[PDB]
C-alpha cells in the first residue's frame, strides 16, 4: 500500500483524489449547501458543510489527497470559508491537465502555464473589487457581510444568526483593527429551538453550578482538574469506602477540611473554584455555607476553553495556588443563558479571547451545523480588519477572470498557452458547482454567464432563479466575497495543485 | 545454495539499474520534477534530490544496494550531483548491453572505460576556466546549481541567501559548509519564505514584562542545568537509600535557586557597569519564575530552552568563553557579543547573537508551518550550502548544463584509443552515456530529445563553441553567455564514481543468494 | 482506515435501505391496525404497538436506520399515538422520486418542494381545524365522553363502553397538567365485579405480600403512615459467619435469641420513626411479618417499584432504602387506608390522599386475554382524551384530511410547476398511503374504499374517511373519529425533515472503519 507503479501517481492518482474532492463542495457549498453524513470514531452522525471539518474527519491513505488538506488548513488559518472553494478549483485544475498529457505535454510545462497565469490572475484580482464598505462598530454593516458567510453553511435562519455573530466580534473587541485570534467559544445546550441561541460575553459554564458568588467585582480562579473528595495541601484524603465507620468519621471531618481548602484558595485570590471532577457531599454542604462558587463536572474541551482564555492551567492537586496558575476575570454572575440558569463570567479586552454564543436547538447536529458557519465568520471579521475591499459573490467573479486569462493565453504563445486556456476553465468549476448544488445543468449557466459581459456581478444563486437557471446580481443580493479572502483562496489552491501535479512514483523500504 | 552463472546473470543485473534510473529520470532539472516520497509510517516528502530518494526508501534490487554505495561517496566528497550520477550509468549499461547482445567479452568493454575517463579528465582541464570569488559570479552558479537539484522558485528565494552565507569565510579552504549549516524552522503564514541573518539564532527566546529586548555589548553568560542544584553541568537523580535522604535534598534545592540567581545579578553590577552594558543569560533548561522576576528586573535578557548543539556554536559565535554554570567562576569567563537581539515573529521568540568574533556560523530562518513544505524548503538548503561551497573552493568552475557532454564526445573521436578496438568499444558507449543530460532535459522540455541533440553537435563543431540545451525550451544556446554553469567539483568527481561501478558490474557475472 | 462512498449508487443505496426498514412501521397502528412481536438478545419476546418503542429496541444497521429513531422518538414524546406514521410517510416520499433519481433526475429543489408543500399542508390543516372544547361545550366533559366511548368501541368492547367512559373522563380531569402512564395505570383481576371496572382517585397496589398473616394485622386505617421502603426484612437477623458457634451450654440460648433481637430492633426503627403501614419492594420476612402483627401494623413485601412511585406523587412522600425516617414529607400518609381483596388478590387502596393525583383502574373482564385487550381498549381512550384536552384544535382522524390534501396538493401540481408537479404529486401520492395502509392492515381493498371517498371529497367535506370497525366510508367527524390538528402538523414537519436529510446526503463516512 501507499506506493504503486504504472503511471498511477501522475495521471491516475490525482484525478482519483479529485473524485473525493468532487461532491464535497459541489452540492455541499454555495449560497446554500447540502448536508453530508459522517460518523466519527465516536459513534454519531455528523453533518458537514465546511471542507476542513469533514476532511479532518475523513482519513485518507492517499498522499495526493493530503496536500490540499494542508492547503485548506492554511485557508482556515488565513481566510476561513473558501476551503470548499479550494477543493473544486484545485480539483478541476488537476483534471484539465491530463488531456494536455494525452497531447503529450510534460508535467512541468503545464505547471509553468499555471504559475505565470496565477500571477496574472492575482494582478486581475484587484480589478474585481466592487462596493468596498467597512464599519467595525456597526452590527448592521457586519451582519450584512457575514450573512453570506453563514449562508454557505446554513439553510434556515440567516437573519437570526447574522445579527448574533455581528454582535459578538464587534463588542468583544472595541479596538478593532488588530482583532484577536479567536474570541468566540460555542455553548451547545440541547433543548429549546434555534431562536433560543444568543451571545454571552465572557466564559459560560453551562454545566452544573453550585453555591453562589463570593464577589462580583472580581472573578479570580484557581482552575483544578482534580476532585474535592478530600484533596488537600497535605496528605490527600479520599472518600473512605473501605470501612463504614471510617465513612462516618470522614463525613464529620470533611466540612472542616473543606474549610481548609476554601481558605487556601480564596486568600491567595479567587471567588470561583473550577471543579473538573467531583465534590463530596459534605464538601458540597460547606461550600454553600462559605458562599464560594463551585462549578462541577466540566469536560476536557470545557477545561481547554477555560485554560486558554484566563492563562491559568488546571492542577492535579489542592494547594495554595501559584501566580502563574491563577486567572483573573472581570465579573462572575448568575444569569440565564438561553433562559436556563447557569453561570456566566465577564471577559473584557483586559481578559479577551472569548465571547460565547450559546447553541440551542432540538438537535445537536443542527447545533453542530451552526458550529460550522460561525468558525469562518470569526476569521472573516479578522479578514475584515485587514481589508475593506469587497468582491461580489462566488462564480460571478470567476467569469470575468476567464475571459482575460483566455486572452492572456494567446498572447503568450507556447505550450504554457494551452494550460492558460485550461487555467481559465478551472474558474468555471464554481458555476459548475452552484449548478450542481441546484441540480441543474452547468453549460446552460456557463453560456449565460459568458454572454452578459457585465460579468463580475452576474451569477445564479441557490434560488428558484436556479430552478430554470437565470443570472442575478450577486452584489445586490447580499452574497459577497472580499479582496484578501479570495486572494489566498486562489493563491493556496494554485500552490498545492502544481506541487501535487509535480509528484512522481513512491518507493518504500 | 543456488547459483546463476551465465550472461543472463549479468542481464538481470543491467536490467534492474536502468529501470531505477528511469524513475529518477523524472528528476534533475527545473523542468525536471519533484518526487513524492512517503515513509513507512507515512510522511509526505517532495524531493528531487538523489541521496534522499535513494538512501531512505527503496524497493528490492541488488543494484539498489550497489548504487547506494557510489552515491554515498558522491554525497561524501561533494554532496551535489547525487541526482546527476545516476543518469550516466543507466545509459552506460545500455550501449554496453548491445555489444554483448552482439556477443563480446565483458572485460574488453571494461578496459575502454578507463581510457574514456583519462581522455576526458584531461579535457576537464580544458573545458573549465578560472572564475572569480565574486558574489555575482557565485550568484550565476548558485541559481544554476539549485535548479538542477531543486525547484527554480526555490532557487530564486535562495540565490541571495546561499551566496552571502558561504562568503562569510576569510578564505577558509573547505568544499562543503560545516557551521554555516544551521536551520531554524518556523511556523509562518508563508510556506515559502527565507531569512538569512548573520550569527546564530536561538530556537526559543524568552519574555518577562521587565526583561529587556535590545542589548548592546551583550556579555553572554551561557547557562545549563538549572537553579535547583548547584555547580552542576549535568542532571542527577535523587537519593533513595533512606527515606530522610529523599527529603533533605529538595528542602535545600530552593536555597540553591536563591544562591545562583544571586551570583548572576552580582556579576552584572561588576562587569556591565550598573546597567550600562547588556547582559544575556542563555539557559539550556527551564527558568524558574522566581528567577524570571529576579533576572529581568536587573535588566538581564534571560533565555529559555536552548539546545546543546546551540551551545557549541555559541562558543564560536561569541568567540569568548561560553560557560555552563550560573555561579561566579571568573569575570573573564564571559564571551563577548556586541549585539544580541530577540525578534519575535509568529508563535515563537527568536534570539539572535550578532557582532560575532567568527563569521563562521550563520543561520537561515526557515518559514512554513506545513511540514511537506517545511521538509522541502529545508531540503533545498543543505544541498545548496554544499554545492556553492564547492564552487568557491574551486578556483575553476566548469560551464555546465550539458555543454561538455557534446564537447567530449566529439573530442572522443576514435582510432586514437586504438589498440585492438576494445578501447574503442568502451569509449563509444561512454560518449553515448555523456549525452543523457541533454537527453533528459529536452525530454522534460519540448524540442525532441535526440532531434536537437545532434543539432547541438552540429553547432558545437562550428568554431568549437560550447552550446547547451535550454532548460525551458530545449533550444540550443551558448552555455557561457547564458551562464548555465555546473560545479567542477561535481563534474570532476562524476567521472570517477561512474567509471568504477560499471566496471564492477562487468566483474559480476555470477549472483548467489 | 475509513469507510466512504459517494454519489447516486450510495444514494440509491441510501433510499432503498430506509424503505425496507420502514416496512414494519408502515403497516401498524390500530385495532384493525397492528400490534407487535419481536425477539431480541436472550430470547426476550416483547409485544408493542409503538414503533418508537421498538425502534429503540431494534438495532440500527444503517445511518438511515439511525435517521428513523429520533424522528419516531419526536412523535412518541409529544403524543404517544401515531408514532409510526411519521416514519411511514418519510420513506413513502422516496418511492416515487426513486424512478426520477435513477434516471439521473435529481434536483436539490426536491427538499424545498418538501417544505413548500408542507406549508400549504399545515396551513390547510389549521384553517380547517375546529376548536371543540370552546365551541362545542362550556363544560366539555360530556363532549369527552362521546370521544372516549368511540375510543372504547374501536378496540374490543361495544357494551361496556358506556360504563367505562365516565370513569375515563373523571380520571383524565385529575391527570390534567400531567401525561404519566404510571398514574393512569390499570390493574387486573378476575373475580371482582366481572365485566366492570372501577376508578379510584388515589393509589392502588397490585402485588402485596400476604399468606404470612393479614387477618392478624389491622388491614385498614383512618390515618395511615406509609413507609415507602426498599429494604429486605429477614426471617431472622444474623450473627457472624467466622467463629460462629453452638454447643456448649453457657453461650447457647443467647445466640439463638441474639439472632432475633437485632431484627425487631430494626423493625422498631421503622415503628417509632412513624409508620402504621409499611411497604417494601424487597420481600419482608415471614417471622418479621408477624412482628408487625405484634405492634398491630400492616405490612407487605414483594411490591413492584412502579406502585411506590404512585404514592410519592399523591402523598407528597418519597421512596426510601433506609430503616429510619426523619420527616413525614419523605414518608407517605393518607386519611383512609383500606385493604380490599378483589378477585382474590390483595389490593391496598389509598383514598384521602393529600393530592390524589394518581388514578388507577381495577379491571375485571370476562377472562384474562379478554381483559388484556380490555386494558388496551381503555388505554386508547386515555391516550386520545388527554391529547384532546391539550389541543382543542381538532380535526377528524383516520387520514380523512390526507386524501383531501392529496387532491388539494395535486391541484397545486396542476397550478405551480416548472418541474414541481413530479415532486408535489409524489408528495400527494404518499399522503393517501396512510389511510390506504389503514385499509390494508384492516385487509380490505383501499382502491375500492379510498376512491369512493374522493368523490364525496369532490363535492365538499374533508372529514370523509374510514370507519374501520366496519370498514366503510364515513365522515370521521360525524363518525367521532378525531385527533388534534397539531399532531399531523408535528408529523408533517418531521416526515418531510428526514426526507430532506436523505435527499441532501449522498455519502456515509465511517471513520473508525467498521
Amino acid at each position: 500500500a501507499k506506493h504503486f507503479s504504472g503511471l498511477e501517481e501522475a495521471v491516475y492518482r490525482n484525478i482519483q483524489a479529485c473524485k473525493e474532492l468532487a461532491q464535497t463542495t459541489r452540492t455541499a457549498y454555495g449560497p446554500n449547501g447540502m448536508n453530508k453524513m459522517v460518523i466519527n470514531h465516536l459513534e454519531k452522525l455528523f453533518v458537514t458543510n465546511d471542507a476542513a471539518t469533514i476532511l479532518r474527519e475523513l482519513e485518507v491513505q492517499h498522499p495526493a489527497a493530503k496536500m490540499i488538506v494542508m492547503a485548506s488548513h492554511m485557508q482556515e488559518q488565513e481566510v476561513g470559508d473558501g476551503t470548499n472553494f479550494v477543493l473544486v478549483f484545485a480539483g478541476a485544475l488537476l483534471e484539465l491537465a491530463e488531456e494536455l498529457l494525452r497531447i503529450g505535454l510534460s508535467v512541468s510545462e503545464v505547471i509553468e502555464g499555471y504559475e505565470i497565469a496565477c500571477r496574472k490572475a492575482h494582478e486581475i484580482l484587484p480589478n474585481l473589487v466592487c462596493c468596498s464598505a467597512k464599519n467595525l462598530r456597526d452590527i448592521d454593516e457586519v451582519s450584512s457581510l457575514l450573512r453570506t458567510s453563514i449562508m454557505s453553511k446554513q439553510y434556515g435562519n440567516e437573519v437570526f444568526l447574522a445579527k448574533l455573530i455581528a454582535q459578538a466580534c464587534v463588542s468583544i473587541f472595541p479596538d478593532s483593527g488588530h482583532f484577536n485570534v479567536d474570541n468566540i467559544r460555542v455553548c451547545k445546550i440541547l433543548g429549546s429551538g434555534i431562536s433560543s441561541s444568543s451571545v454571552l460575553h465572557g466564559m459560560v459554564f453551562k454545566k452544573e453550578t453550585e453555591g453562589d458568588v463570593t464577589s462580583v467585582k472580581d472573578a479570580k480562579i484557581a482552575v483544578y482538574s482534580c476532585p474535592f473528595d478530600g484533596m488537600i495541601t497535605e496528605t490527600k484524603g479520599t472518600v473512605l469506602i473501605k470501612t463504614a465507620e471510617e465513612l462516618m468519621n470522614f463525613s464529620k471531618g470533611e466540612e472542616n477540611l473543606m474549610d481548609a481548602q476554601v481558605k487556601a484558595i480564596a486568600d491567595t485570590g479567587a471567588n470561583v473554584v473550577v471543579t473538573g471532577g467531583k465534590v463530596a457531599d459534605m464538601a458540597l454542604h460547606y461550600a454553600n455555607k462559605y458562599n464560594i462558587m463551585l462549578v462541577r463536572l466540566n469536560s476536557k474541551w470545557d477545561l481547554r476553553r477555560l485554560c486558554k482564555t484566563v492563562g491559568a492551567t488546571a492542577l492535579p492537586r489542592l494547594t495554595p495556588p501559584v501566580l502563574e496558575e491563577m486567572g483573573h476575570c472581570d465579573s462572575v454572575y448568575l444569569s440565564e443563558v438561553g433562559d436556563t440558569q447557569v453561570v456566566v463570567f465577564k471577559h473584557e479586552k483586559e481578559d479577551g479571547a472569548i465571547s460565547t454564543i450559546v447553541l440551542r436547538g432540538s438537535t445537536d447536529n443542527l447545533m453542530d451545523d451552526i458550529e460550522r458557519a460561525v468558525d469562518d465568520g470569526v476569521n472573516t471579521f479578522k479578514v475584515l480588519t485587514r481589508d475593506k475591499r469587497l468582491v461580489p459573490g462566488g462564480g460571478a467573479t470567476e467569469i470575468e477572470l476567464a475571459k482575460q486569462i483566455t486572452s492572456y493565453g494567446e498572447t503568450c504563445p507556447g505550450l504554457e498557452q494551452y494550460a492558460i486556456k485550461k487555467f481559465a476553465e478551472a474558474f468555471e468549476a464554481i458555476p459548475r458547482a452552484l449548478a450542481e448544488n441546484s441540480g441543474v445543468k452547468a453549460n446552460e449557466v456557463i453560456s449565460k454567464l459568458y454572454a452578459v459581459h457585465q460579468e463580475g456581478n452576474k451569477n445564479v444563486g441557490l434560488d428558484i432563479e436556479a430552478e430554470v437557471p437565470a443570472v442575478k446580481d450577486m452584489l445586490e443580493a447580499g452574497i459577497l466575497d472580499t479582496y484578501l479572502g479570495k486572494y489566498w483562496a486562489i493563491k493556496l489552491a494554485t500552490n498545492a495543485a502544481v506541487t501535487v501535479l509535480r509528484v512522481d512514483q513512491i518507493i518504500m523500504a | 545454495a543456488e547459483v546463476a552463472r551465465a550472461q543472463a546473470a549479468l542481464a538481470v543485473n543491467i536490467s534492474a539499474a536502468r529501470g531505477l534510473q528511469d524513475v529518477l529520470r523524472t528528476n534533475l532539472g527545473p523542468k525536471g520534477t519533484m518526487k513524492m516520497l512517503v515513509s513507512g509510517a507515512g510522511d509526505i516528502k517532495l524531493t528531487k534530490d538523489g541521496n534522499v530518494l535513494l538512501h531512505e526508501m527503496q524497493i528490492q534490487h541488488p543494484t539498489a544496494s550497489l548504487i547506494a554505495k557510489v552515491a554515498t561517496a558522491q554525497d561524501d566528497i561533494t554532496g551535489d550531483g547525487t541526482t546527476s550520477n545516476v543518469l550516466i550509468i543507466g545509459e552506460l549499461l545500455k550501449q554496453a548491453d548491445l555489444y554483448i547482445s552482439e556477443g563480446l567479452h565483458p572485460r574488453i568493454i571494461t578496459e575502454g572505460f578507463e581510457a574514456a575517463k583519462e581522455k576526458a579528465l584531461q579535457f576537464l582541464e580544458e573545458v573549465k576556466v578560472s572564475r572569480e570569488m565574486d558574489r555575482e559570479t557565485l550568484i550565476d552558479v548558485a541559481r544554476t546549481s539549485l535548479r538542477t537539484k531543486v525547484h527554480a522558485e526555490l532557487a530564486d528565494v535562495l540565490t541571495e541567501a546561499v551566496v552571502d552565507s558561504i562568503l562569510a569565510i576569510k578564505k577558509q579552504d573547505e568544499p562543503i559548509d560545516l557551521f554555516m549549516i544551521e536551520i531554524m524552522e518556523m511556523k509562518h503564514k508563508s510556506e515559502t519564505d527565507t531569512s538569512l541573518i548573520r550569527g546564530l539564532v536561538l530556537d526559543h527566546g524568552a519574555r518577562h514584562p521587565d526583561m529587556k529586548k535590545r542589548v548592546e555589548d551583550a556579555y553572554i553568560l551561557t547557562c545549563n542545568v538549572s537553579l535547583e542544584y548547584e555547580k552542576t553541568e549535568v542532571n542527577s537523580g535523587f537519593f533513595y537509600k533512606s527515606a530522610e535522604e529523599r527529603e533533605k535534598l529538595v528542602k535545600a534545592e530552593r536555597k540553591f535557586i536563591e544562591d545562583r540567581v544571586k551570583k548572576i545579578i552580582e556579576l552584572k553590577r561588576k562587569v556591565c557597569g550598573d546597567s550600562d552594558k547588556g547582559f544575556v543569560v542563555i539557559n539550556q533548561k527551564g527558568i524558574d519564575p522566581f528567577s524570571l522576576d529576579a533576572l529581568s528586573k536587573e535588566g538581564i535578557v534571560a533565555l529559555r530552552r536552548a539546545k546543546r548543539r546551540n551551545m557549541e556554536r555559541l562558543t564560536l559565535a561569541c568567540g569568548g568563553v561560553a560557560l555552563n554554570s550560573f555561579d561566579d567562576l571568573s569575570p573573564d569567563c564571559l564571551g563577548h557579543a556586541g549585539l544580541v537581539y530577540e525578534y519575535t515573529l509568529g508563535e515563537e521568540k527568536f534570539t539572535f547573537i550578532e557582532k560575532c568574533n567568527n563569521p563562521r556560523s550563520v543561520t537561515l530562518l526557515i518559514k512554513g508551518p506545513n511540514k511537506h513544505t517545511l521538509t522541502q524548503i529545508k531540503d533545498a538548503v543543505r544541498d545548496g550550502l554544499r554545492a556553492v561551497k564547492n564552487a568557491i573552493d574551486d578556483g575553476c568552475v566548469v560551464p555546465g548544463a550539458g555543454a561538455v557532454e557534446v564537447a567530449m564526445a566529439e573530442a572522443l573521436i576514435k582510432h586514437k584509443p586504438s589498440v585492438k578496438g576494445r578501447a574503442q568499444l568502451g569509449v563509444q558507449a561512454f560518449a553515448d552515456a555523456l549525452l543523457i543530460i541533454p537527453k533528459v532535459l529536452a525530454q522534460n522540455s519540448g524540442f525532441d530529445l535526440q532531434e536537437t541533440l545532434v543539432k547541438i553537435q552540429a553547432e558545437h563543431s562550428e568554431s568549437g563553441q560550447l552550446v547547451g540545451v535550454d532548460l525551458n525550451t530545449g533550444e540550443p544556446m551558448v552555455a557561457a553567455e547564458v551562464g548555465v554553469w555546473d560545479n567542477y567539483c561535481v563534474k570532476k568527481q562524476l567521472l570517477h564514481s561512474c567509471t568504477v561501478i560499471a566496471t564492477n558490474i562487468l566483474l559480476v557475472d555470477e549472483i548467489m543468494r | 482506515g475509513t469507510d466512504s462512498s459517494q454519489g447516486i449508487p450510495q444514494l440509491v443505496s441510501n433510499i432503498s435501505a430506509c424503505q425496507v426498514i420502514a416496512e414494519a412501521v408502515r403497516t401498524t397502528l390500530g385495532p384493525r391496525g397492528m400490534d407487535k412481536l419481536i425477539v431480541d438478545g436472550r430470547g426476550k419476546a416483547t409485544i408493542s404497538n409503538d414503533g418508537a418503542t421498538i425502534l429503540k429496541l431494534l438495532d440500527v444497521v444503517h445511518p438511515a436506520a439511525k435517521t428513523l429513531v429520533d424522528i419516531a422518538k419526536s412523535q412518541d414524546a409529544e403524543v404517544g399515538d401515531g408514532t409510526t406514521s411519521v416514519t411511514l410517510l418519510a420513506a413513502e416520499f422516496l418511492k416515487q422520486v426513486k424512478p426520477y433519481v435513477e434516471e439521473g433526475l435529481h434536483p436539490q429543489i426536491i427538499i424545498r418542494a418538501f417544505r413548500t408543500a408542507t406549508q400549504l399542508a399545515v396551513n390547510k390543516i389549521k384553517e380547517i381545524a375546529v376548536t371543540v372544547k370552546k365551541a362545542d361545550k362550556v363544560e366539555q366533559r360530556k363532549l369527552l365522553e362521546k370521544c372516549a366511548m368511540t375510543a372504547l368501541s374501536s378496540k374490543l368492547i361495544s357494551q361496556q363502553k358506556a360504563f367505562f367512559a365516565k370513569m375515563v373522563v373523571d380520571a383524565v380531569m385529575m391527570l390534567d397538567d400531567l401525561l404519566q402512564l404510571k398514574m393512569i395505570g390499570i390493574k387486573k383481576v378476575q373475580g371482582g365485579a366481572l365485566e366492570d371496572s372501577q376508578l379510584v382517585a388515589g393509589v392502588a397496589f397490585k402485588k402485596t405480600f400476604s399468606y404470612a398473616g393479614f387477618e392478624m394485622q389491622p388491614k385498614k386505617y383512618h390515618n395511615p403512615k406509609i413507609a415507602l421502603l426498599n429494604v429486605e426484612l429477614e426471617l431472622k437477623a444474623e450473627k457472624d459467619n467466622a467463629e460462629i458457634r453452638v454447643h456448649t451450654v453457657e453461650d447457647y440460648q443467647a445466640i439463638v435469641d441474639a439472632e432475633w433481637n437485632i431484627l425487631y430492633d430494626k423493625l422498631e426503627k421503622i415503628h417509632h420513626s412513624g409508620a402504621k403501614v409499611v411497604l417494601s419492594k424487597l420481600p419482608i420476612g415471614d417471622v418479621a411479618t408477624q412482628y408487625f402483627a405484634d405492634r398491630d401494623m400492616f405490612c407487605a413485601g414483594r411490591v413492584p417499584e412502579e406502585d411506590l412511585k404512585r404514592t410519592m406523587m399523591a402523598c407528597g412522600g418519597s421512596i426510601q432504602t433506609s430503616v429510619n425516617a426523619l420527616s413525614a414529607d419523605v414518608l407517605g400518609r393518607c386519611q383512609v387506608f383500606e385493604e380490599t381483596q378483589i378477585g382474590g388478590e390483595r389490593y391496598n387502596f389509598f383514598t384521602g390522599c393529600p393530592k390524589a393525583k394518581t388514578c388507577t383502574f381495577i379491571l375485571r373482564g370476562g377472562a384474562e386475554q379478554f381483559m388484556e385487550e380490555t386494558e388496551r381498549s381503555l388505554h386508547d381512550a386515555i391516550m386520545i382524551v388527554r391529547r384532546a384536552i391539550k389541543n382543542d384544535s381538532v380535526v377528524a382522524g383516520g387520514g380523512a384530511i390526507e386524501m383531501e390534501l392529496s387532491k388539494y396538493l395535486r391541484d397545486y401540481s396542476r397550478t405551480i410547476p416548472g418541474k414541481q408537479q413530479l415532486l408535489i404529486g409524489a408528495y400527494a401520492k404518499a399522503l393517501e398511503i396512510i389511510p390506504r395502509q389503514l385499509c390494508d392492515n384492516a385487509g380490505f381493498d383501499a382502491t375500492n374504499i379510498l376512491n369512493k371517498l374522493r368523490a364525496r371529497h369532490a363535492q365538499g367535506g374533508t372529514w370523509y374517511g374510514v370507519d374501520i370497525n366496519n370498514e366503510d366510508i364515513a365522515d370521521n367527524f360525524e363518525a367521532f373519529v378525531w385527533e388534534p390538528a397539531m399532531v399531523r402538523i408535528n408529523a408533517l414537519t418531521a416526515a418531510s425533515e428526514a426526507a430532506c436529510l436523505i435527499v441532501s446526503v449522498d455519502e456515509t463516512i465511517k471513520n473508525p472503519r467498521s
Side-chain angles (χ1 to χ4, degrees), chain C residues 355-480:
Chain C
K355 290 173 69 176
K357 299 298 294 296
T358 303
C359 294
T360 302
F361 292 96
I362 308 303
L363 182 58
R364 282 85 60 193
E368 291 293 327
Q369 301 303 112
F370 185 80
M371 180 169 63
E372 290 178 351
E373 294 292 327
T374 309
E375 185 183 6
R376 293 177 289 176
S377 302
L378 292 169
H379 181 75
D380 195 5
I382 299 174
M383 291 298 289
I384 194 54
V385 170
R386 289 182 292 172
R387 187 60 182 170
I389 292 188
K390 297 295 288 184
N391 203 172
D392 54 352
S393 177
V394 169
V395 297
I401 310 299
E402 296 173 351
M403 299 174 290
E404 179 68 32
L405 286 173
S406 300
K407 182 175 68 180
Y408 180 71
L409 295 170
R410 291 184 184 96
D411 296 331
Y412 292 101
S413 298
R414 184 259 183 94
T415 302
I416 199 178
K419 60 185 177 181
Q420 300 297 106
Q421 64 187 3
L422 301 176
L423 277 303
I424 302 173
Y427 185 84
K429 181 66 174 65
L431 296 174
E432 64 184 1
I433 305 303
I434 299 107
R436 184 176 301 277
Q437 182 56 251
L438 286 175
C439 296
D440 288 331
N441 59 17
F444 291 170
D445 289 332
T447 314
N448 286 318
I449 297 303
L450 300 175
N451 283 319
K452 291 180 183 179
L453 285 164
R454 271 79 60 83
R456 297 185 300 170
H457 285 294
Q459 296 179 356
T462 180
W463 295 268
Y464 294 102
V466 180
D467 191 4
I468 63 177
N469 291 319
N470 292 318
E471 189 61 35
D472 52 348
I473 61 178
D475 190 80
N476 286 326
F477 183 79
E478 292 293 326
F480 293 172

Side-chain angles (χ1 to χ4, degrees), chain A residues 19-24 27 32 34-43 45 47-48 54 57-60 155 363 366 436-440 462-464 466-468, chain C residues 1-4 6-7 62-64 66-67 70 105-109 111-112 115 416-420 497 500-501 503-514:
Chain A
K19 301 298 185 292
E20 296 180 353
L21 268 61
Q23 287 74 243
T24 312
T27 183
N32 287 116
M34 298 300 168
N35 291 318
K36 306 291 178 291
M37 290 300 174
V38 180
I39 300 176
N40 284 323
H41 295 81
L42 296 176
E43 181 65 32
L45 291 173
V47 289
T48 53
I54 180 180
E57 289 167 350
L58 178 64
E59 294 177 351
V60 293
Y155 179 74
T363 304
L366 297 171
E436 289 170 354
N437 204 169
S438 300
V440 295
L462 263 289
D463 297 327
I464 63 176
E467 182 179 0
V468 175
Chain C
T2 287
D3 293 331
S4 64
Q6 293 186 357
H62 294 93
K66 297 178 179 66
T67 310
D70 53 351
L105 183 63
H106 176 73
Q108 295 307 110
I109 306 174
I111 55 108
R112 70 186 70 186
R115 299 297 188 186
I416 199 178
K419 60 185 177 181
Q420 300 297 106
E497 182 178 1
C500 287
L501 295 175
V503 174
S504 298
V505 176
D506 57 347
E507 63 183 3
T508 59
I509 298 184
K510 184 66 183 294
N511 293 325
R513 192 182 58 82
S514 299

Side-chain angles (χ1 to χ4, degrees), chain B residues 189-425:
Chain B
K189 293 183 176 67
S190 297
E191 300 294 333
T192 304
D193 192 4
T194 299
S195 296
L196 175 63
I197 300 101
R198 300 294 180 91
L200 182 62
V201 185
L202 184 57
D203 54 355
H204 173 62
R207 181 63 64 192
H208 186 74
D210 293 329
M211 187 182 289
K212 298 294 183 181
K213 187 177 178 66
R214 173 69 63 82
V215 292
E216 294 177 353
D217 290 330
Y219 293 157
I220 53 105
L221 179 60
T222 307
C223 290
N224 200 353
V225 176
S226 180
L227 295 158
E228 291 83 3
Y229 291 162
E230 191 182 7
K231 295 183 184 294
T232 59
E233 298 180 355
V234 68
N235 295 112
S236 296
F238 288 160
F239 289 163
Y240 289 163
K241 291 174 70 176
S242 178
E244 295 292 327
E245 291 177 354
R246 182 181 64 84
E247 294 178 353
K248 287 175 69 176
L249 293 175
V250 297
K251 298 296 187 292
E253 287 177 352
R254 298 290 298 169
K255 299 291 184 182
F256 301 121
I257 299 178
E258 180 68 30
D259 292 331
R260 289 172 63 79
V261 67
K262 180 176 71 176
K263 301 293 189 293
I264 297 172
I265 61 178
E266 71 184 3
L267 190 66
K268 196 263 187 296
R269 275 86 57 84
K270 292 185 286 184
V271 186
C272 296
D274 294 330
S275 179
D276 294 330
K277 293 181 289 295
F279 187 73
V280 170
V281 169
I282 310 109
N283 208 170
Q284 293 298 321
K285 292 177 70 67
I287 300 176
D288 292 332
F290 181 75
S291 175
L292 183 62
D293 300 331
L295 290 176
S296 299
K297 292 177 177 65
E298 185 68 30
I300 298 172
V301 183
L303 285 314
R304 186 180 295 114
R305 290 195 291 112
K307 293 181 179 180
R308 273 74 176 175
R309 177 72 267 173
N310 289 118
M311 185 272 291
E312 297 177 353
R313 289 187 179 93
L314 197 149
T315 309
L316 183 67
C318 73
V321 178
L323 293 176
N324 283 317
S325 296
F326 297 169
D327 289 333
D328 289 330
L329 295 174
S330 294
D332 58 352
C333 293
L334 301 174
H336 175 71
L339 183 61
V340 167
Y341 176 63
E342 177 180 358
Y343 181 76
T344 298
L345 188 64
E347 294 178 354
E348 192 67 29
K349 299 179 178 65
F350 296 95
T351 304
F352 303 97
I353 174 168
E354 294 176 354
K355 186 65 174 65
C356 294
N357 290 320
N358 298 114
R360 185 81 275 279
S361 295
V362 304
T363 300
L364 276 301
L365 184 58
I366 298 303
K367 302 291 194 293
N370 287 321
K371 181 67 176 178
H372 58 87
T373 61
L374 188 61
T375 305
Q376 181 178 0
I377 194 54
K378 180 178 85 274
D379 291 330
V381 170
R382 276 80 54 84
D383 290 332
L385 290 177
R386 295 176 291 173
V388 185
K389 192 68 177 176
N390 297 120
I392 197 181
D393 196 6
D394 294 333
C396 295
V397 181
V398 66
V404 188
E405 311 301 320
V406 297
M408 182 55 210
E410 295 179 355
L412 196 57
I413 190 61
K414 276 76 175 172
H415 292 286
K416 297 185 290 187
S418 66
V419 47
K420 288 193 286 184
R422 63 179 181 177
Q424 294 177 359
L425 288 167

Side-chain angles (χ1 to χ4, degrees), chain A residues 338-444:
Chain A
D339 293 332
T340 178
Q341 182 58 254
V342 297
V343 72
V344 42
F345 292 97
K346 180 65 175 65
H347 290 84
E348 201 182 4
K349 63 186 180 295
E350 65 183 2
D351 295 329
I354 186 184
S355 175
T356 55
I357 302 186
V358 59
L359 303 186
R360 293 182 65 94
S362 299
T363 304
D364 187 74
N365 291 320
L366 297 171
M367 295 153 59
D368 294 332
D369 195 6
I370 62 198
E371 190 270 332
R372 297 290 186 268
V374 296
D375 294 334
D376 298 331
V378 170
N379 302 114
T380 311
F381 187 75
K382 186 172 70 68
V383 168
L384 184 61
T385 56
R386 288 192 294 272
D387 59 352
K388 68 181 293 295
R389 299 178 67 187
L390 271 68
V391 172
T397 305
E398 302 295 325
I399 50 170
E400 186 170 358
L401 297 165
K403 300 293 184 182
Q404 298 183 1
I405 288 298
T406 308
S407 298
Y408 179 69
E410 62 185 0
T411 54
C412 291
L415 278 306
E416 290 86 5
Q417 174 182 8
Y418 295 160
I420 298 175
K421 303 296 181 180
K422 297 292 183 70
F423 187 77
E425 292 294 326
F427 297 154
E428 299 295 325
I430 312 303
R432 281 192 293 270
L434 270 66
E436 289 170 354
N437 204 169
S438 300
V440 295
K441 62 182 291 185
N443 285 321
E444 182 64 30

